[PDB]
Design a protein around this nucleic acid. Structure first.
Length: 468
DNA sequence: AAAAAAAAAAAAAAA
């Protein structure tokens, strides 16, 4: 039978590759969102070459001392998650998971010699993200659920703000296990209050399922829900697919039909590109480029025009006529496409980092390396160096040493212990430790009144003292 | 047989 796997990480920082996880929690459920099996919760021991983001710690309320005492090493941490995730017929999901948690999981698997993507697809698996489901529910089919307005009078979609707005036990927020229930409940609510949409959006979580909607040649208009648009637009707009992204295969170039389409008609590509990557604050008295990408593998909400009803339009302040006009102009002018696609054909302006943790997206691993890395998983730690393997991917050697050094220091010899002590010395430089102490010493002189917040800060200094 | 593109910028979620 098929199942839904709700999960939520509590990390030591925002950057998934560079920051480490602190806590993991997950619950297995059926299609009706009824709890199957026991709830899974466990902590991760942070390595001795990393300090947490003090902000993240003020949010999570979990000190490295607690995680070190309670948790397991990252190799086990990854094993337990990979065990749960690889169960056949499992749809893994959470809240804002595609653009955070899943990025963590991928690195956790990447750092600990597990396949970073297989969990999402292999054995009839998939993933889902409820965030845009809530935005789509509010935008398209709000009747039934209470929607919390912001200070400016705009719709908020923070989990804690939702569960409280619909009478659900949201006491003690930012807790791995407490958030999963709050998510499951939020799903259960939308499933009950609005099934059709919930199903549509579910079945249309698939890369190939979305594809069907895209008729680039005919520029068939589609409803697109995304936070990138804006809460004043119900995070919603009509869009038209101009062309497939020239390099990335999972991306497609969408034109915003609500935006002013003059720049595309007037300016050339080279200038448009520069015009696309400019801030609204420092941008002058010009209309911005009404173009964005949609990553069909990142659970984007797409539907056909008629899904967005003229009522729901008037409710969200979206001019249907203006969208219908620009479409006719875009259909009337092919030359617009030519210039647009060329914007996304340019090569990567950023130089790749030499930090092995951040190289996940430097291509896939081969079958030989993929197999050889399994033998590394099966081979016991102590016997890892004795095993002579000829790897192809230069990342593997650096990944290994870090794996063994972080997870199994006691398996290191003298040289390996020394070069690690150097690696650490390069991380915890006086100027790095000062800036940290400055960041703490600032925050304490800011949250001084909050004894709970201070206690957490002090703990970070006491940790920072005993780690170096 | 299949899986991906971090970071310029749009906004708003997550730690």
């Amino acid at each position: 039978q098929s199942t839904f796997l709700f999960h939520d990480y509590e990390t030591f920082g925002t950057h998934p590759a560079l920051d480490r996880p602190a806590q993991f929690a997950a619950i297995r459920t059926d299609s009706e969102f009824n709890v199957i099996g026991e709830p899974e919760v466990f902590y991760c021991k942070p390595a001795d070459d990393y300090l947490p983001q003090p902000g993240a710690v003020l949010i999570t309320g979990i000190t490295p001392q607690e995680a070190r005492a309670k948790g397991e090493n990252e190799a086990a941490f990854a094993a337990r998650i990979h065990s749960l995730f690889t169960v056949p017929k499992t749809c893994i999901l959470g809240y804002n998971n595609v653009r955070f948690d899943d990025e963590v999981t991928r690195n956790i698997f990447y750092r600990n010699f597990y396949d970073p993507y297989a969990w999402s697809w292999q054995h009839d698996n998939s993933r889902w993200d409820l965030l845009d489901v809530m935005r789509a529910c509010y935008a398209l089919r709000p009747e039934g659920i209470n929607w919390p307005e912001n200070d400016d009078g705009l719709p908020s979609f923070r989990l804690e703000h939702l569960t409280k707005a619909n009478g659900i036990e949201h006491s003690n927020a930012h807790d791995a296990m407490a958030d999963v229930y709050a998510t499951i409940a939020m799903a259960k609510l939308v499933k009950t209050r609005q099934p059709r949409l919930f199903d549509y959006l579910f079945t249309h979580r698939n890369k190939h399922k979305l594809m069907a909607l895209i008729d680039v040649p005919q520029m068939k208009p589609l409803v697109h829900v995304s936070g990138m648009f804006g809460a004043w637009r119900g995070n919603t707009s009509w869009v038209a697919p101009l062309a497939w992204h020239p390099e990335n295969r999972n991306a497609v170039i969408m034109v915003d039909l609500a935006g002013d389409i003059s720049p595309l008609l007037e300016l050339d590509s080279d200038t448009l590109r520069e015009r696309l990557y400019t801030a609204k604050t420092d941008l002058g008295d010009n209309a911005a480029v009404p173009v964005k990408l949609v990553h069909i593998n990142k659970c984007p909400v797409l539907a056909q025009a008629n899904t967005l009803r003229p009522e729901d339009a008037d409710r969200l302040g979206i001019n249907r006529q203006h969208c219908l006009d620009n479409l006719k102009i875009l259909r009337e002018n092919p030359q617009v496409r030519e210039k647009v696609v060329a914007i996304f054909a340019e090569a990567e302006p950023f130089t790749p980092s030499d930090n092995v943790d951040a190289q996940l997206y430097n291509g896939f691993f081969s079958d030989a390396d993929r197999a050889a890395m399994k033998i590394v998983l099966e081979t016991e730690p102590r016997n890892l160096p004795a095993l002579d393997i000829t790897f192809v991917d230069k990342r593997i050697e650096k990944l290994l040493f870090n794996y063994r050094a972080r997870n199994f220091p006691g398996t290191l010899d003298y040289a390996e212990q020394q070069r690690w002590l150097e690696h650490r010395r390069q991380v915890f430089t006086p100027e790095f430790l000062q800036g940290y102490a400055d960041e703490l010493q600032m925050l304490v002189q800011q949250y001084a009144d909050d004894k709970e917040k201070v206690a957490l800060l002090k703990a970070l200094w006491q940790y920072a003292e005993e780690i170096v």
